[model samples]
Every structure is written in structure tokens, then in C-alpha cells.
Target: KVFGRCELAAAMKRHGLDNYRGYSLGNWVCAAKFESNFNTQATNRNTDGSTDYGILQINSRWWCNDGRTPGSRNLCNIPCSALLSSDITASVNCAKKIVSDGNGMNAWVAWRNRCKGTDVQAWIRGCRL
Candidate 1:
């Protein structure tokens, strides 16, 4: 499921990403824009043989267990497949783990390139908070 811009914003916020760990909601929104275009089924295979799953693109190597990847820490203790769904609860839960684990949003380089050091407010400019 591909979420609308404001729909993604509100969903992410509703799931507790708004200012989570001091990172603004726009950071998540902008990162999701670049990482997956708000598509719940987005997947990107990495050169290291680990895959990224779902909207926030949680990776297999350190987060979810994809089984195909060797040495997956599976810190989220979830199957990678769970991240791909229109219901983003799993995605948001794993996302909270990522941020709270101290990797910050920089875990996704998409955030560094697009959302970092910018006025991310534009990502949610007209959305109701």
C-alpha cells in the first residue's frame, strides 16, 4: 500500500513517531519519501546480501530476521516479512527500536542525504499535526 503524503504523516504520528527521540515527524516522512515513497511493500536488496523491508526500509542484517541473511542480529525479533503491510504498526514498532537503540535516523542514509540539515517542515507543510 502506498500512503498519501499527509496520510503517511498522520499514520506515522499516530504510531508514535512524532518527535520521537527528538527527531521530528518530518524526518520520518522525508526519509520514508526517499526510502520507499511511502510504499508499505517496498523492498531493497543490499550488496551485503541483506534486504531492506517495508516503508522505513528496516534492514535484515541488524533488525529483522530475513533468514536468507547470515548473521542477522534480528534486534527487532521479528520476521522481515512482517514489515511489509498496509498496517504500519510493525514497521513503526521496529522503527522505534531503531531510533531508541541509538543509531538515530542516520541508520537510513536516505535520511542523511535528504532530510538531514534541511527544513524538513516542507515534508509536512500543509498536513494537520
Candidate 2:
């Protein structure tokens, strides 16, 4: 499922992404744009031998057990395929785990490159949570 900017913002905000662990809704929404363009089923395989899945692009190396990543940590205790579903609840939950683990949003280069220290408020100005 591909979500529009405001739609994704509202959805994520509903999932408690607004200011979740100090990261605002715009930060998450902005990172989602660069990571997956708000596509629920988006997947990207990296040279690191791990895969990123879903809108937030949870990784296989440490977040999910894809059974293919060399050292799958399965930290979120979920199947990699689970992140592809349109229902983003599990993906969101796993995202929270990733940030709460101390890595924070920096876990994604997309967030670091595109979202950090930017005008994230524009991503959710008119979109009410």
C-alpha cells in the first residue's frame, strides 16, 4: 500500500509515532519518504547482506528473522515478511523497539541524510493526528 504524505503522517501519528522517543511525526514521515516512499511492501537488499523491509524499512540483520540474513538477530521477534503487510502495526512496533534500543532513528541513513535537522513540521502541518 502506498500512502500519500498526509495520509502516512496521520496513520503514523495514530500509531504513536508523533514524538515517540523524541522523534516527531515529521521525522518519521520524512524518513519513510526517502526509505520507501510510503509503500508498505517496499524492500531493499543492501551490500551488507541484509534486507530492509516495509515503510519504515526495518532491517533483517538485527530486527527480523528473514532466515537469509547471515546473522539475523530477530530483535523484534517478527518475520521479515510481516513488515510487508499493509497493516503497519507490527512494523511500527518494531520501529519503536529499534529506536528504544538506543540506536534511535539514526539506524536508517535515510533519516540521517534527509530528515534530521530539517523542516519536518512541513510534513504534518495541516494533517491532524
Candidate 3:
């Protein structure tokens, strides 16, 4: 598992993704809890029931089709998978970018309002990129 901030920060830097270390661990942890339950080996099925591979929960079909087709598989890179394969900080950093892109923590802030303190049992499932 990704232990803490510094490690995650270094990974983010290496991958050319942004890192929100001390102030944002909670957001990262929140995303992980929802996304893969912190499973470095997580995978999921699409609406058409196809499979996604790896820790960042990348779709194998999209990753293979899009990632491998042009040999641009680097596009499929996500921090958790990188961390799992290499180091956890890198993986968390990757995740940090995904979280921050839609506006710094706006994604999580929106999620908390929609899901947290609500009776919505499947709120987490309703959240996705």
C-alpha cells in the first residue's frame, strides 16, 4: 500500500503528474476507498460488461485498444499501478492528477456532498471519471 506523502509526491513528480501531499492525503484516501478499496490489483467491468485491468482500475479493452494500438500505452499509466509495479508513491501521485484535473479536489468535494451523510447505499458506485 502507499504508505505516506513523500513517497507519493516523488512518484507524482516522476510521472509528470501533480501531487497534493500533506493537505490532500485525505482526498487521495477517499478516492481509493471508493475506486478500488485500496486494492492495487483491482479490476472492474464496464457497462457492456468488459474488463478493466490493474490497480488504477484501467480498462484492458480501452487500454489495449487505445493504449497499445498506437504504442501510446503510456497514456494508460496511473499512479497506483505504477506504485504496485514499482513504488506506491508513484501510483498515488498518478491518482492525484486524476483527482485534481477536474479542479483541485472539486471531484471529491462533489462526491462527498452527493454521497456522504446520505442514505444512498450505492453512492460510491455512482461516482466515476
Candidate 4:
């Protein structure tokens, strides 16, 4: 697990995610909180026979190939297991591409349901970026 929010922020910033595309760092942090709670190994199987990977919870149907999901686009061209690593480089890169695909943070349901239109400052509060 991550040390805390500040650590997560610093890692994201180092990966050049503090303000990526049109999404704020707070949005990313908030999404991470609800999606994976900062655990890189987090994985969730959806009822649609798809799985979400990593801190960003990217869907297998569109992003990575998890072997279990048939007809996965594997658009990122990386194994889903790579996203489960603590390094986060592959996951961050995939997230950037996902955001650049025009989904923005809306690519994540967590962002849409929990973070949208909400005051997200608390996600990064007390964290030095």
C-alpha cells in the first residue's frame, strides 16, 4: 500500500500527472481513492465479464488483456498484470493514453459517480505536491 495521499501525489507528479490533459490532480487522487485505495494489486471483476486494473481501474474490455476476457481490445498493448506492479509506470502511461482518448476522467466510473461536481480538495489536502 502507499504511505499516504502525499506519497501517491508525489509519485503521480513525478510521472507528470499533477495536471495531465484537462484533468486535475485532485480528480486523479479522488478516483484512485475510490477505485483502489492506492493498492497497485487491486483488481475488480465486473458483471460484464470484464476486470478493472491498477490504481486507475482501467477496464479490460478496452485497455489491457487479462487473458480471461475474450475479444479485449488490448489497446494499450500491455498485459493487465503490468498494471498491478507497484512501479506504476505502465499504469500511468496507460492512464495517460486513456485520458488522451477523449474520455478525460470520465473514463473512470468512480470519477463520474463520486468525484464529479464534488469538492475534491480533500483528496489532496495536507499533501505537498
Candidate 5:
């Protein structure tokens, strides 16, 4: 089980990304890859011309409010713990809601390239459906 890790792994698994080769880095890389492609040190200018930064592609900054911890929303754009925390399931649930509320896996596909255009289980397998 992903006990020590964070809800993020379960989140990924729930969304069908079973490949955990990179561990926390897997979440980081996958989110980065889909949102901005491993650009943990990157930032973007919104359509209205605002600024967003960090991995997980966190914007508004305020969305990260988790105290002064290293991964707090107020501290950095995307909380580091978001990917490293054992409570990553929180993040995954958030993502799942976004996906289910509208486009389902399409949302995940938009972020996780490997998860594109496939069933949830197929996505989990990564190597074989």
C-alpha cells in the first residue's frame, strides 16, 4: 500500500496511473509533464496576464494555504508536500473532482500524457492493458 508515501499515489492510482517508478518524483514528473512538463522551477503568465509558478502548476498562490510549511500554498505555488505528502489523496481527490465534474479522464489526459485516450485501468497498467 501507499501508506508512508502520500495520498498522491492513491490519487494517481484512483485516476489510473499505477506506474510509481519515480515514487514522489512520479507525481512531480507526471503533474509537471501534463501541466508544464517537469517545470518545477517554472512559472506562467495567465491569459489575463497574471503569474503562476512551481510544479503542480499552482496559480493564485492562495490556493496553497497550508501554513508556513515548505509546501504551503502561501509559501510556494504548488506545495512540495502535495507530491511528497502521505495525504496526497487529498490532491488526487481534487484532481478527480475536476475530471469527473466535466471531462473525466480527459482532464487527467491533459495533465498526464501517458493517461490520454484510455480507460482508467489501462492507464494504470502503463505497460499493458
Candidate 6:
């Protein structure tokens, strides 16, 4: 599924992810934009042999299992493919659990390398949220 910026912000709000864990909604929006461009089916195989799943680009090595990968920790206890669905409730919940584990958005490299410390207001601008 493809989502525009405003639509993504609305979904994040509806899922109560706006300002979650002291992180701004713009952070999440910016992370998603850089990670997957709001495409639910997005996946990337890292050079380290790990795969990132969904719009959030959750990692398979420590978070979820794709079955194709061996020795997955499956910390989230959900299939990596589950995150590829258009309904992002599972993804949000998993992300919350990840943040609660003290990783915050740091679990996503995109957030640290790009979204962090950046002026991200444009991510949510004109969304009227």
C-alpha cells in the first residue's frame, strides 16, 4: 500500500503513535519516508544479511522472522511478512514494544542517521493534525 504524507500522519494519529514515547510524530513520519516511502511492501536486504520489513523497515535479525533467514531471534514474536500488510497496527505495536525496550527510534538506523536532530516539521506540515 502506498500512502501520502498526510495520510500517513492520519494513520499514525489514529493508532495513537503521535508523540509516542516522547518522540514527535514528525520523527516517525520522517523515518517512514526515508525508510520505505510509505510503501507497505517495502523490504531491503542489508549487507549484513539482515532484512528490513515494511514501511517502518523493521529488522528481521532481532525483531521478526522471515523464515528464509536462519537464527532469527524473533523478539517481536511475529512474522516479518506480517509487517508488509497495509494494516499497520501490528507494526505500530511492535514499534512501541521496541521503543519500550529502550531502543526508541534508534532501532531504526534511518531515524538516527537522517531524522534525528533534523528540522522535521515539514514531515507533518499541512497535515492539520
Please, what is the whole-model Cα lDDT of each candidate in the order they appear? Answer: 0.93, 0.91, 0.43, 0.87, 0.41, 0.89
* Residue pairs with backbone overlap in model 2: none
RMSD to the true structure for each prediction, in A, is 0.9, 1.0, 9.1, 1.2, 9.2, 1.1
The number of the candidate with the highest TM-score is 1
Query: What is the Cα-based TM-score of model 2?
Result: 0.95
lDDT of candidate 4 over 26-113, digit per residue (tens): 8888889999999988999999999999888888998999899987799999999999998988989999999888767887888899
Candidate 4 wrongly placed segments (more than 4 Å): none
Candidate 6 local lDDT, 1-129, one digit each (tens): 998899999998899888899988899899999999999899999887889999899888888998877777898899999999999888887888887778788888888999999998889999877
lDDT of 3 by residue, 7-125 (tens): 43334345544335333333444444555555565656566544444334544333333233232234335422343453444444444554555554443443365434444323223
Weakest lDDT window of 10 consecutive positions for candidate 1: 99-108
Measured by lDDT, the strongest candidate is 1
Tens-digit lDDT string for candidate 1 (11-111): 99999999999998899999999999999999999999999999999999999998899977899889999999899999999999998877788888989
Displacement of the residue 33 alpha carbon in candidate 5, Å: 3.0
TM-score per model over all chains: 0.96, 0.95, 0.42, 0.94, 0.35, 0.94
For candidate 4, what is the TM-score? 0.94
Q: Runs in model 5 with CA error above 4 Å?
A: 1-11, 14-32, 36-43, 49-87, 108-115, 118-129
Stronger candidate by TM-score (1 vs 2) = 1
Deviation in angstroms for 28 in model 4?
A: 0.5
Model 6: CA > 4 A from native: none
The parts of candidate 3 lying over 4 Å away from their true place are 1-23, 48-86, 103-129
Using lDDT as the measure, what is the rank order of every candidate, best first? 1, 2, 6, 4, 3, 5
Indicate the residue-level lDDT of 112 in model 3: 62
